[PDB]
Amino acid sequence: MLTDNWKELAGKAQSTFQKSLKQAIELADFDEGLAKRYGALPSAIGANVEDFGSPAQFPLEEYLKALPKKVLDITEKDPVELLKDLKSRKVTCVEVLKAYTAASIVASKLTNCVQEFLPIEALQYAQKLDADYETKKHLPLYGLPFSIKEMIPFVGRSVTHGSLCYLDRIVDYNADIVNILIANGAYPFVRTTNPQSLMMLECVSFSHGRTVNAYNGMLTSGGSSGGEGALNGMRASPFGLGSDIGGSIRCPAAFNGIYGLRSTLGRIPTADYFSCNRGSESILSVTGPLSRSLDTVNLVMKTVIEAKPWLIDPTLVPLDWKRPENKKFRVGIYVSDHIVNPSPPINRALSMVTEKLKSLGNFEVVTFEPYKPEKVTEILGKLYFEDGARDFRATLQTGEPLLEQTRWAIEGAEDLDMHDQWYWNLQKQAYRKEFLKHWCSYTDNDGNVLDAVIAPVFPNVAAKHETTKYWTYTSQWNLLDYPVLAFPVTKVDESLDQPYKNYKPLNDLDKYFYEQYDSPSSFKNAPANLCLVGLRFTDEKLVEIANILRN
Amino acid sequence: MLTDNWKELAGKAQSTFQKSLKQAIELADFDEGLAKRYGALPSAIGANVEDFGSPAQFPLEEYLKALPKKVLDITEKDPVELLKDLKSRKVTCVEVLKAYTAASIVASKLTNCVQEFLPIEALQYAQKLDADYETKKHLPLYGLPFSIKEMIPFVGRSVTHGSLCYLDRIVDYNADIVNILIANGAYPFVRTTNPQSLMMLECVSFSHGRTVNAYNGMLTSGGSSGGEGALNGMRASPFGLGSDIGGSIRCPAAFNGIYGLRSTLGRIPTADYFSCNRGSESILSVTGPLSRSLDTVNLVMKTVIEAKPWLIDPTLVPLDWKRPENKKFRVGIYVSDHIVNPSPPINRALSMVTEKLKSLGNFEVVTFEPYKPEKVTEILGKLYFEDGARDFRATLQTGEPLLEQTRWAIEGAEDLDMHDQWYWNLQKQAYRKEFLKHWCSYTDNDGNVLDAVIAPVFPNVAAKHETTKYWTYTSQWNLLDYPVLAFPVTKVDESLDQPYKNYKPLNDLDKYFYEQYDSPSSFKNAPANLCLVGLRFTDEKLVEIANILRN
């Protein structure tokens, strides 16, 4: 690592971004009308990484007004549909790159979701893909650009996960999943922001400033894949890759009203990502796609898994990506863990999705009760930072300040002795086994297991900054390693989502979240998403049920 | 102005307040004990600007219990005495700022009297005042913080007078009176609340909610300088600057049992304040200080006038602030205007003050009769809103609701033709001339004019919400532009202040105010104040007579 003063390093980070932003504008080739509107947009980028600017109230509305038909006709197109145009040559690989580059630039200024553009290598990828049209026409993602979280290695770049001390950590390789996607006709064109330590459900770092929600600029984008949620919520990327060890894929997707899949560990390669606590295996992160488009989520998983990634990454299981043949479904609704109750907008989403499933004949819908959700915090309290956060704190030798959200994640971290880790590994495996028995207790008399559970992603829609003080609605499924797909349902409705009256809080933490929901106007136009949870390796059931819920 | 929906804007206003509240708490640096008691105080701030919370029964009692010795030893000290401590350096400017900031926070939660704290610039002010101690110790207000009504421009801030549509009206300058006070060693540290339209003797707006009385949380703070009256009634500010066009300095001062000077127009600069009807000159507002200290009111007046403000504001008169040379006094008592009789607490305040002046040999005391007080309503009914309230109603284009109190002030407003204004300007000047003839009819055989008149500020102590339906006891002296000093006398006494028996009302409006005074318990602990009225530019006589009335 580095030991220079952090203010100098933040400058170096800003320079890298500004250097890539300059090259991107050249690639995008604005006409004067757009250059004018772009110049006049409210920015979530400040003068320094501690200055958070003055973001728009509805960044997405500003985005749709600012960008021309020449761009939106491509970036607003569903990526699976756009792949048809790229295949039939109604649109060029370079043409698509130019539009999405322009979109990401406008998205970058409005939400601060881009850490580094990749226009040099992206133009080379897109140019040769056009030249090779006849031989690569058949590839399943031919011509499609995509975004990658900054923690994902890309050739010749620093990989820092937001820590300034790692700005000299250059890799000469791509992540396995990136090379696989390139082998299938795609290419990365932008690197998205990630926060300090990665262990916050928001997106603040001293490498980029603060990332904000795509639908309401006063709220967080979520985290840790906050850039990914914002960029793909603005539909300025066809899809992106994030990571999820505590909700870091599903929380951004839910806050920005798009799809995000925490895929089951052992399906797609993620270990070559960079994070804190490298070599820690007690609790493992997973990767997975975020996209505006469910069909795009499904196609990336299918494309990656059909490339047989277990022949490059031996931690992976050779299990085909297969659409389920189920005609009937048994589904549970997780109304609350009875520790922190959901805010009205989430509560209405649960009823909406419940009533829709009941209206289809082939769904049996039951209430799903929690199982010792307090044990999630206790076990993850010992295993997230099992070295007592020594590795993370060493990143602060530059003088880099400790963010308030990071404080929550590392407070109480013990430096575990080997026997302490063994104790909590046994606690971890026992809880997983107990929870499976809980899930199977919902099997019916004929032996039909629960296919999926519908649950909140968070006790609320996109949070106000520095208030993501409860993780269980996402970290529960990291402790269990269950596949979870966040999906859209509705938006805040000011008539329907007034605060609960005569509410009696369940505890101090529940009271905090109740008071956080002061009125729906504080979360105007914020998406209310939910998630589908399945047993391990049932990812595809979740996609199929999400398909039905959106038709 | 703005045209966004008003609920979004109320959000931005609350956000501005809440972000500055966060910064104020860090400046004050609560210890664990104060943070605990503060957190558990009953709040007059709601979840939204239409939810008024549940204020304490006696906010001042809770304020004195909640704050530590380290703060109260400063904020309860008379500011003129505190200036000696600041001059001799027994206390630092930063120490005084920290204490009063802490006091204003507790006062803000208990009464809802703060619109925006100013801790960033105040810390800069206090720090450089400490650094410049040797060169600036000689200044007359060295080290003293003060509060300013939100309508008073301060650098870098929006100036809205409570209207949500003006939240983007940012100023790059201070008001003249602020700069003059800074030149003499003072600095502003908090901006206080003001109501919709500014034309109510209460303090309700869609920028802040509802402001309540410092002595009884069920009653109004008064208005329009309601924030100043509550904050200074809690002695959480050394003094404040308000405005007075219809009673808006004396009504807050009287309701909260402190001093408030409506200075003669043309002595102290006020024109650069913001209100509705900018450019209207038929009836002009004035400014002046509010404080718990009579000596502090006098020193502020003396300080600003000795700065020769007519060399910055050419509407002002070069008339020195001079203590009067009087040995005898001739004083009139205004028991009633015979349209609305005062309630028992006010009538007892009049008796107390009469007997005290009569017991001193050098005061001649006579009864003072009204002169066509009905004409006040008639003339001000045409000149307060001479454009037919078009300028104010244009503020409600955001959908911001019209408050009941604002409704009273704008009902019946005509859009005057130039000739109509000429007609009513003549009525105004004739009434002023006639009234002077009335006042001089009290001159004695030797030619000694009446030096001052003692009158109610309102037909009662601090009113119940939405009942301030009679203005003449203050607006009479705005039509005439006479200086008036509100001053404390007594408090409600439940034995002495029972409702009048066998009362016969004078008219429907008198009946309404009689029924409002249901029992002294409805106004428990409410200060009963009066005011001193003088001829134009005799402000100092009013200060000197108040000095005697307090011993």
Automatic annotation (TrEMBL), chains A, B:
Keywords of this entry: Hydrolase
Family annotation (Pfam families): Amidase
Catalytic site positions: K149 (charge relay system), S224 (charge relay system), S248 (acyl-ester intermediate)
GO MF entries: hydrolase activity
Domain Amidase: 95-542
Residues at which substrate binds: L198, S224, I245, G246, G247, S248
Family: Belongs to the amidase family.
Descriptive protein name: Amidase family protein
Species in which this protein is naturally found: Candida parapsilosis (Yeast)
